[PDB]
Design a protein around this nucleic acid. Sequence first.
RNA 1: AUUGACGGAAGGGCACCACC
Lengths: 313, 360, 184, 63, 78, 141
Amino acid sequence: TEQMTLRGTLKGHNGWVTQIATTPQFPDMILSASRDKTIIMWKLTRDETNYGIPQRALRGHSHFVSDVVISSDGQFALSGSWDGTLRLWDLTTGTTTRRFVGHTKDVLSVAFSSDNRQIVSGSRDKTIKLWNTLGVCKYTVQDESHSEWVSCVRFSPNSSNPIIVSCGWDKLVKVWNLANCKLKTNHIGHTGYLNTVTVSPDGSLCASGGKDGQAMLWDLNEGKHLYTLDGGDIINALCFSPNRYWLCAATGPSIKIWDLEGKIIVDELKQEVISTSSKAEPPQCTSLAWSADGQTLFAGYTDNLVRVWQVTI
Amino acid sequence: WEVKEEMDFPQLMKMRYLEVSEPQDIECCGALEYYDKAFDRITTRSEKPLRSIKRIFHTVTTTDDPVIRKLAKTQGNVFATDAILATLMSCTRSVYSWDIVVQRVGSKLFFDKRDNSDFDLLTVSETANEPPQDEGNSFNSPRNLAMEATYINHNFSQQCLRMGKERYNFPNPNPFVEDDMDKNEIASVAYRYRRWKLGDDIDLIVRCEHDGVMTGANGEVSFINIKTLNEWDSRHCNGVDWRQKLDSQRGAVIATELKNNSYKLARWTCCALLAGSEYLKLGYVSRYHVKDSSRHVILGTQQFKPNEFASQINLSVENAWGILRCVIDICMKLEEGKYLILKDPNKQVIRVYSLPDGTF
Amino acid sequence: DIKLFGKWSTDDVQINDISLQDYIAVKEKYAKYLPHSAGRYAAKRFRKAQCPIVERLTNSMMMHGRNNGKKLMTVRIVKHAFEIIHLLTGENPLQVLVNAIINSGPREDSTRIGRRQAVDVSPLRRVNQAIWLLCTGAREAAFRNIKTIAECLADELINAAKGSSNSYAIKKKDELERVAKSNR
Amino acid sequence: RVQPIKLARVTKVLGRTGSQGQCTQVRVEFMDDTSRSIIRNVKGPVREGDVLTLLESEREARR
Amino acid sequence: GRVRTKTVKKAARVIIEKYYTRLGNDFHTNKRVCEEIAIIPSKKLRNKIAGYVTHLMKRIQRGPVRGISIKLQEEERE
Amino acid sequence: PLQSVQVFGRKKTATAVAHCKRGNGLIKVNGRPLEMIEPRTLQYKLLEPVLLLGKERFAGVDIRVRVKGGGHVAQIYAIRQSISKALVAYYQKYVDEASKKEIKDILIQYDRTLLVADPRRCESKKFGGPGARARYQKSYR
RNA sequence: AUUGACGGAAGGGCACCACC
Ligand SMILES: [Mg+2]
Ligand SMILES: [Mg+2]
Ligand SMILES: [Mg+2]
């Protein structure tokens, strides 16, 4: 009875939707990063004609935007791109304030701290480098880093053992201790490149996924391995859920929602049938985001859309 | 049942009486409503779906209709409501059978609607090269494709104009044509009464249709009609894609629709001509994807003059009015008994049957 | 409400010939304020059927090599010819132009296979031929004569649109059909 | 003195012909008789969907 | 012309046979992989090779193309 | 108070830079009004943005164009493109993106060149003839 | 018997320094 429905789309993009971000302060505004080199700040006018309308575009970078994240107060955004830079946007004006320029190659992912004091990024030059809110590269880890690219680097919103979780294309999940920027635990399980990594809201669990189509849950207190779930296709993004004990994943063109207590698929959200001729693959979901109330799932896609899945009861 | 008159399409091809003066007016009634240029200018690669609107049925025979019934017995002896002379004006184009009831009671010659194995609903692809199979209860079956087509010209008619805005009110109300209780869904559709000379007391009291009015670029009254086509399964009847060609090769789309639908286009053209309207609006409607009904999208609207377009359906109003006069001539020898004009479906020749004991 | 040169409406023209409906571009999307635009219509095939018909008439008037490239001159002679047409006839000059295109186009030609077997004519090619015939009729009527090119263009396509044989384009069309009928 | 002209819609373009490659061959469907798809030679640029004015009908092409 | 030459096709084939596990049907990620793993002296040749790699990976999914030998043979137990 | 954008528009070698700021409906090219630019045959090309978008869309801005390079016709096409792109960029940056979408659809639907530059430029002459493709007349016998 | 060149041989292809 707790399945979802398709409540409407958010047109207005000219490329794949590589990342979507929300914030608990403003429940009427989401950010979507794309491959048309622009970020769109939406306004959720939940009406019949359109669920959302593009309120304001941000047009800084010169390549695809590959990540985006909103600060805690919901005022400053942080974006990373394939041109090798990071930008700290001020949402009210719509213009950038700081431009981080250390990274040589394409910046795959960006993250913020819980208190937004220090930020971290990851890139195709096989380095994970921290920064601060003023604009200077503080510390660039190089010892025992990933042998291939880094594709998702995230913090952990929890006071005890503040850590940096990361994953890359060498099939390894590394847990970094933030106080000394030293390696702490190395996870070796995955058998294909890792496209995403996520941390549970309650700061106890972590998830990881990629090419092998399987999602592995790793404990963050003792570095163990709880279990592993199997998705149909390439896991392009994972996203835990704040209110409910669920893990969502974007497997190929569908979205699988694994419960974490009975470990069954509660729902497998599929898009409707279009292009009835069986000559082309459907568009693949690329990103996932949960609203703070946990009643709405925003899903990026490959046909330049952003679909809105609403949970029912 | 008695057999009285039978004539083929060949005789209708060479029947003519060009005696049609500039028409007068008797009375105009019915509130009008304006349109939206943005809904008109919707074009290919900029789609918009087709919802459902509520059409208040207003098809009534002249005798039962109170406005006509308070004017038919007063003056005039030949009467025919709108979209009913098209039957006699599309004989050489049609291949199927229609049914209508001309009652020659006394000197009165008033047309009325009757049903005998055929209905008044829209007929699609009737006279095309390699006609559709229409077998069983398929998606392309005749009654269901016709029901889908009537669905579209009922909904899109009430979906192209700004219906929610304050409807302009003409001076005379339409009596009993959806007037008993104000359902508030009474459309812009107005009806005129006009009289023109054609022959031996053939001052024809004729109803008209105005499916809306469009405000001028400078601003004035300019009546319009809203009627639309439908696309389905382009491989059949030697079709062509509208979602790839409407923007730059719309002329070919009109050409192939004329080639496919000829009786239907003539049926519409008769109405758009006799109404004296300014613009004829043809909407272009197509399915969301092939082999899937109950879902449609409006791909555009084209404006052409109802007279110019009558010249482009290779239809002569002279021979049309003449075949009308000649079918009235063939219906002049008959008597007070009414006549159900049921054509022959398989082999297209016009026919009629005098009704025993007023058969209905 | 886009009016050609600011004063000629474009929604009451009527292309009465079904064949030339999608080649004489004059209404609803093809309305423009001027017969001048950076074209790029000779890039791909058939793209010049998406050009406004007055800009084709303007383009085909920059001819004989002393008037090559002089498009502003042809724009103003088209403007002046349209004003002369509206004075003489009493109807929209775009309608008169469209009727001159329809009447002046040849619909059966004769190609050299050998003796010249008759052939049918494409709609785009008969639009091309109609434009070229009207332009050269105007051009050769205004050469070494006190009349100006605006009056000659006006009287040329007025006589074309009405169908009389005193135009040059009607003479050439009749001659082409006469040979292509006597030599089927 | 001769029969009236007819209109015909091009159905598909078969390929070009003529000595210098000037003409092109198409198969047209009449707009009145709704049958008898005949091959005709047409001068000038022709594509699918075009409407042709046939000054003389009932004559088949070279092929 | 748009006809890829022998250098583009042969390079694409060797890249696929050696690095099948790192290529999807995405031209841009393929371009980045081929610029990490190969030494291509220009940027047009890199783009042409990545385009043919993308076009071939869109054929690997629909059966084994003649000319490419990979570990996919093993999973054809049948 | 810094509400201003500078956007450009190019036709062949011409380049017009339109400066659009907050103001009260004034458009001036090189200090001259918009209805006094010299090729008054092609006046409606200059008036086309204001005639498609109306006056209320322009009645809250001050536009001042400065054009340099190219010939007369190329200069007024640059003026056209710069005015349209300037209004679109001002609308995008300072009011809302829905309004930008609406006016960009109106302009793009009428004519693409109001927001996309024409990429054609003159070709290079070769050493066989008078121009790029033409060649000198060749003689036999 | 082979390679080249030629045929006022017989088939294909190409080029606005060839044509339409
Ligand atoms: Mg002179
Ligand atoms: Mg030169
Ligand atoms: Mg020559």
